[PDB]
Write a protein that binds this DNA or RNA. Structure first.
Ligand SMILES: O=P(O)(O)O[C@H]1[C@@H](OP(=O)(O)O)[C@@H](OP(=O)(O)O)[C@@H](OP(=O)(O)O)[C@@H](OP(=O)(O)O)[C@H]1OP(=O)(O)O
Ligand SMILES: O=P(O)(O)O[C@H]1[C@@H](OP(=O)(O)O)[C@@H](OP(=O)(O)O)[C@@H](OP(=O)(O)O)[C@@H](OP(=O)(O)O)[C@H]1OP(=O)(O)O
Ligand SMILES: [Zn+2]
Ligand SMILES: [Zn+2]
Lengths: 382, 436
RNA sequence: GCUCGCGAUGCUGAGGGCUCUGAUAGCUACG
RNA sequence: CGUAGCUAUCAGAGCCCCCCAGCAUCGCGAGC
């Protein structure tokens, strides 16, 4: 049943969080927002496993961008929990590639289309302890009211619109049709760094998948099968934000779709957390022994070291896998020089999903996507 | 970590809170201390860093220098390094410019004091830095919008501060030329003299130093200050920052590299004076020795076959002790300029290239030609460095500066040859006007 | 129904100042 | 063996200043 599934993953993610903070005692149990992914392999609750857990509510300061991929740009909890799912994807890949004995315990099989795909009946589920910023939270940032008045104004231009977190300022701000293009040059000088809101990033994952461009060179697209909120659930706002606002999307590459995961809140809504919001963010993937703590305003850990989630890390997980995947077993055969931005461009089909996405928002009056300065990915491991 | 050393090595000290400037976000506190007799000072966004800069100015003087945060903050020297030590010049230039922008705005009270980038040029007469003199002050970070571009040189294409500062330095240099030319006692005080090779040169050991509150946009700023392609970039008005050029207005970084080859005086002034180069480029923030140096000259060290007097100027590069702090937020639409001799600042809308009531700047193309024309009809035609008969149209009188246009084209190839893109010039019809 | 303007009451990441408490770290004083 | 005092740094609470540009609800005017 759907409501039992919701409360299940709600409890799973909490319990896993506690084990890592010794029953929420640890100094790093302090949070404003919790998130996590959970994997199911069958309808039995005994078949459900927590893949990752995370906290955080802030984004990097403009002047700490890393031109060599060493800083985390966006530490909103659910953004972080996807990045930790990505590590688990790279692990289950190196797992399959050890020998035929190990490869049975991987979640991937070989795909009858090229590259790899998940085995049947393995699904991932996203838990956020609050509604994702922008289109799904902005208009009702509050615990839903027993006596409804749902919206009242579903046709205002502001409904659906793409929106950004904005450096050192409140709100998630719609994309202006005047102001456009961010530059490395500029934000160092003082132009406040725009980051696309979390309701937007999750709508994107509902089209291009949760795996990213780099992993799509090995894997077929993957989707969240449910999205569960621990508090501040609003069925119409959420359904609008996660997909319905772009039901005008067309021409997606094969195996891409507009995914419509199950949406649901939980029975016992989580409680507001009192205090100043922590400026740090913790992350944990299945297979790690402890949590990692990142200063969100620096996108680095307390001693200035890069995270296991940063672009440079993930490039390196990606290369190790690249080096043992037979050129024939690739999903793309495009060759690009070994720099982060360029390897991404080798995922031609993913890049065209992306393009249809950006177009669906634009044609629907909902604004044009805001990207980071191109310099941000023009780094190499060499 | 610094004042801790000062107050554990002379532990009876107390600092006094002097002043505070600006408005709660562009606000800077100044903190002074007098340790072992002499009066130290530092500036900062918060009090604990202001007094940390003052305490470091104390530890460097009374004892010696601090933790040398890599070579990145360490100054690059020039060639024939006079005018005393680097950082002591840099701190003086910065103080002078910032102080004079004070006087120009009711000690920072005016609304026109609100700015993101501050720039200026100051002049020295060698030996002693107490002989310095601020030549020009300016602000701004926006360019003209295409809809407002002028066909008769009545609009300012580019109002990024550091560019506006150079246009003011021009105004200064026309002024000093006219000083020499209006009687024989007045040529006593002009900065120019007559040259061996024709026209005027500068009097031995007069130098100009360029200060910018931050690193110039484009190449010098493409790095992360909390841990290589010298390519050419263009501004993108519709915003701040730059885009690399593809295989529009040039980036400040590129324009200053240019001036590091063809000189700061432009074409029209070259007809009268030998090339003039900056001796220092001092940054009030975002200083990085390798990135600045590359942007400013290294990226085109493959330049060659320059006309006689031209060269690849390799000036002083230096940050400052009391660096400015990044203030995220909207950039102003206005640009302020002032040249020594002027009564007040002039205020430009950078999106219109004209001033607050729609008039032409003293810095726009038409204005500068007008002074150029007036000095031309004053100097004998045998004293000219480039013979230019019957000057009428702006673009042709520029072309008369034939040695300069050579240096321009050597520069343009030196960029292409290094794989750094091809310089973007504006449609030549914009300089097709006369004073008629 | 929506949009624009003016007003009102609220909602939701920065900077700075002054105090209360707690660890680390260095240096003093006293008995 | 203690306890006072003085600079530095990190974490938490309390107060005030300042900003930030969206969003809800309502009122008035106007348009589609
Ligand atoms: O938010 P994240 O989870 O880090 O996703 C980021 C990133 O977003 P942020 O810049 O907000 O972090 C990019 O977004 P843009 O800013 O460039 O839009 C990017 O997308 P690009 O493809 O444009 O780089 C890319 O996602 P993808 O895997 O589809 O490239 C990427 O993931 P990385 O952190 O791996 O760069
Ligand atoms: O505004 P500034 O940076 O002070 O320099 C400008 C101008 O630059 P913008 O057009 O970017 O305003 C021209 O540069 P181009 O676009 O044409 O390259 C021009 O160059 P040319 O006239 O040589 O094409 C010329 O420099 P110069 O006068 O030394 O030739 C000129 O100064 P003026 O505004 O005095 O013409
Ligand atoms: Zn968010
Ligand atoms: Zn500039």
């Amino acid at each position: 049943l759907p409501q039992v599934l919701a409360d299940a993953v709600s409890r799973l993610v909490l319990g896993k969080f506690g084990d890592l903070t010794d029953n929420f005692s640890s100094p790093h149990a302090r949070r404003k927002v919790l998130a996590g992914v959970v994997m199911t392999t069958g309808t039995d609750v005994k078949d459900a496993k927590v893949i990752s857990v995370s906290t955080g509510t802030k984004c990097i300061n403009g002047e700490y961008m890393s031109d060599r991929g060493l800083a985390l740009n966006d530490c909103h909890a659910e953004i972080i929990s996807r990045r930790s799912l990505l590590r688990f994807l790279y692990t289950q890949l190196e797992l399959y590639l050890n020998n035929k004995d190990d490869q049975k315990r991987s979640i991937f099989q070989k795909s009858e289309r090229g590259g790899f795909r998940l085995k049947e009946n393995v699904q991932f589920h996203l838990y956020i302890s609050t509604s994702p910023c922008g289109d799904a939270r902005i208009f009702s940032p509050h615990e839903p009211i027993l006596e409804e008045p749902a919206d009242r104004h579903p046709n205002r231009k502001a409904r659906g619109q793409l929106r950004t977190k904005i450096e050192s300022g409140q709100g998630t701000i719609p994309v202006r049709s005047n102001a456009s293009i961010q530059t490395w040059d500029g934000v160092l000088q003082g132009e406040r760094l725009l980051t696309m809101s979390c309701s937007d990033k999750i709508a994107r994952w509902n089209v291009v998948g949760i795996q990213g461009s780099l992993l799509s060179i090995f894997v077929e697209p993957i989707y969240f099968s449910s999205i569960i909120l621990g508090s501040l659930y609003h069925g119409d706002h959420l359904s609008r934000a996660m997909y319905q606002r772009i039901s005008n999307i067309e021409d997606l590459p094969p195996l891409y779709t507009l995914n419509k995961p199950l949406l649901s809140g939980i029975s016992n809504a989580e409680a507001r957390q009192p205090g100043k919001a922590p400026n740090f963010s913790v992350n944990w993937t299945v297979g790690d022994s402890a949590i990692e703590v990142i200063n969100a305003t620096t996108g680095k850990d307390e001693l200035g070291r890069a995270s296991r989630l940063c672009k440079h890390a993930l490039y390196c997980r990606w290369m190790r896998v690249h080096g043992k995947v037979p050129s024939h077993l690739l999903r793309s055969k495009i060759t690009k020089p070994n720099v982060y931005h360029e390897s991404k461009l080798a995922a031609k089909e993913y890049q065209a999903a992306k393009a249809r996405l950006f177009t669906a928002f634009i044609k629907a009056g909902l604004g044009a996507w805001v990207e980071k300065p191109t310099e941000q990915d023009q780094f190499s491991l060499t």
